């Protein structure tokens, strides 16, 4: 038994493994945020600004497929760690790749530097993330009540990385010293590494030491020669367009595009026509369809304030936060900072709120419903005050209360979310169904990457209010079905 050679107490009465794990995680996320909130700033600032002087609309398109290739990529690597390496060399793996995607950034490798930092990193935590939060459960036993409290306890980790990180680095963005603040990134990074060689082994045990369902000698052979076929013609396309000179981002755009459309359809395809699958387990399928649209609307606009809401909070506010006398310059990294603080001061709020309502509280498709409308109601609020104030620049007051409105939001979807992936799932398609809700941020953050390039042509006020409509428009069509949904 893996719980025979684990501490079951230690870490605020959870196993002493999600101690270690907490420490680890929330430098991973302090890191991996922190690089995030410079990111944008770095590739679109000009080169006498020690930026890399990338066009404007580029830049925000590397942001959004660089996300949706981050959660793109726990498909394999959950695959990887279950078939192969185990979960605990694929946690390992994933983090010196992390911090390898870190330092090639703190070096002065210009356009080289950012796309190698972007494939170790996507590489990393495709290996890493699904893997970590494996472990985390594994250390619960079967009928464990508390693995519920010891997530939401893990994923405090994430948002106070998310949240301190900006904080942070708003100086080196500041000072203009990109390298030093990537460099701060990666020594957080082996940090988080360091804590995990020294504490691991007596606190984690034989927990995901070995893979679940490894591959026959025949299995190796068949796999390795169809990643070996993929991999060598992405590779082949990817020299002869370099030499050719017809080598663009629109190449990973349009190919992230495609596969943020395919992966749901096939996902969903597969599921409704499995033979192992019961009628009622169908179902619920097709009941979780709507619910992928109203958390793919809501993942556009929220993963949009990376990229979308900070630019143009930058270039069209004053930057000047304004309360009740109590007036300061708001630094364009700490934008990033609003959403984590949110979850972390109302996100126990709201878990009472539902359980004190018990079962008369709203059900899956209208807290899914509320969020996105939350999240187009955002994208209105904003656009508004552009349309308002026209070429007037106006309080940053503004750009926050857009951001908060959107993370009300996220607080009436993320649990809701997380809880239809298990619920709506079929004994066969658990790890499947877990897929389909990472999915909502991996093909949101993928049309992203295209959507974007609408701003120039549509203009940023009205293409704020055509987003903003558009997600008010299909969840208002989705609610009126809401009873149906529910099964
Ligand atoms: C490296 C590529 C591994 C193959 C991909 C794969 O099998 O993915 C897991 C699948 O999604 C599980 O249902
Ligand atoms: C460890 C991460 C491995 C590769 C990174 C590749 C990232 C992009 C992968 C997108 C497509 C994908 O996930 O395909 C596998 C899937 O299982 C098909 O059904
Ligand atoms: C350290 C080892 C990096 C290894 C693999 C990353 C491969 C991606 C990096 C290579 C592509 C560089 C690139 O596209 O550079 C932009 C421009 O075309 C030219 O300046
Ligand atoms: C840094 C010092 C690491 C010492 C502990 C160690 O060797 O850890 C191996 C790790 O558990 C992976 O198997
Ligand atoms: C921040 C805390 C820094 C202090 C960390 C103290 C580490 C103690 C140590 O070296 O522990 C070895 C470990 O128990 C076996 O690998
Ligand atoms: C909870 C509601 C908090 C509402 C806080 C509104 C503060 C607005 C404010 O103080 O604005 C000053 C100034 O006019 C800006 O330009
Ligand atoms: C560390 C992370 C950052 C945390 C940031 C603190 C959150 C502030 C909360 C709400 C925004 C303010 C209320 C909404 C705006 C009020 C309207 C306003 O300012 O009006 C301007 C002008 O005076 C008339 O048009
Ligand atoms: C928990 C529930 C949260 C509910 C969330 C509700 C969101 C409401 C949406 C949009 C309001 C738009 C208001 C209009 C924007 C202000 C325009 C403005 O100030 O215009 C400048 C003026 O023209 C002088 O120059
Ligand atoms: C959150 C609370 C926001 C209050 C906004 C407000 O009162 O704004 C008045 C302003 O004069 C409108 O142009
Ligand atoms: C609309 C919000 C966009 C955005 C920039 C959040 C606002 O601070 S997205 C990134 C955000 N820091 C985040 O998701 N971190 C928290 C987390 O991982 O849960």
């Not at 079951?8 to 995680?25: D, I, M, N, S």
């Not at 877990?434 to 390039?453: C, E, F, P, R, Y």
């Not at 989705?478 to 099964?487: D, E, M, N, Q, R």
Request: proline share 4%; charged share 10%; glycine share 10%.
């Amino acid at each position: 038994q893996t719980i025979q050679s684990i501490p079951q107490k230690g870490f605020f009465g959870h196993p002493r493994g999600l101690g270690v794990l907490f420490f680890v995680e929330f430098w991973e996320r302090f890191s991996y945020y922190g690089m995030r909130a410079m990111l944008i700033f770095y590739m679109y600032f000009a080169i006498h600004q020690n930026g890399l002087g990338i066009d404007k609309t580029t830049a925000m398109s590397i942001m959004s497929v660089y996300g949706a290739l981050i959660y793109m990529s726990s498909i394999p690597g959950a695959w990887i760690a279950d078939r192969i390496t185990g979960t605990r060399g694929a946690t390992l793996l994933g983090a010196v790749l992390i911090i390898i995607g870190h330092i090639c950034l703190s070096l002065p490798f210009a356009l080289f530097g950012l796309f190698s930092s972007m494939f170790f990193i996507i590489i990393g935590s495709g290996l890493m993330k699904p893997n970590i939060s494996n472990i985390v459960g594994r250390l619960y036993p079967e009928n464990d009540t508390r693995i519920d409290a010891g997530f939401v306890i893990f994923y405090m980790s994430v948002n106070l990385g998310a949240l301190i990180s900006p904080i942070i680095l708003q100086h080196f963005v500041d000072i203009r010293n990109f390298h030093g603040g990537f460099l701060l990134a990666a020594i957080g990074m082996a940090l988080g590494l360091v804590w995990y060689l020294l504490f691991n082994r007596k606190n984690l045990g034989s927990v995901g030491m070995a893979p679940t369902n490894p591959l026959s000698k025949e299995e190796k052979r068949k796999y390795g020669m169809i990643i070996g076929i993929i991999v060598a013609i992405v590779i082949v396309v990817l020299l002869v367009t370099y030499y050719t000179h017809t080598l663009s981002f629109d190449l990973i755009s349009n190919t992230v595009l495609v596969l943020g459309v395919a992966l749901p359809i096939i996902y969903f395809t597969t599921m409704l026509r499995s033979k192992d699958v019961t009628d009622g387990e169908r179902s619920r399928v097709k009941a979780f369809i709507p619910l992928f649209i109203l958390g793919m609307l809501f993942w556009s606009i929220q993963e949009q304030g990376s990229n979308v809401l900070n630019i143009y909070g930058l270039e069209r506010s004053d930057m000047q936060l304004n309360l009740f006398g109590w007036t300061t310059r708001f630094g364009e990294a700490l934008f990033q900072s609003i959403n984590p603080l949110f979850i972390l001061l109302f996100a126990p709020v709201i878990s009472m709120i539902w359980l004190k309502m018990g079962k008369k509280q709203p059900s899956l498709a209208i807290k899914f419903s509320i969020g996105t409308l939350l999240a187009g109601l955002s994208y209105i609020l904003i656009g508004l005050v552009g349309l308002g104030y026209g070429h007037t620049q106006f309080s940053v007051n503004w750009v926050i209360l857009s951001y908060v409105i959107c993370v009300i939001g996220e607080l009436c979807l993320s649990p809701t979310g997380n809880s239809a992936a298990v619920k709506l799932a079929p004994k066969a398609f658990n790890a499947q169904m877990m897929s389909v809700w990472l999915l909502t941020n991996a093909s949101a953050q993928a049309i992203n990457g295209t959507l974007v390039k609408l701003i120039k042509p549509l203009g940023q006020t009205n293409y704020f209010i055509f987003l903003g409509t558009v997600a008010i428009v299909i969840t208002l069509i989705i609610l009126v079905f809401s009873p149906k949904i529910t099964k």
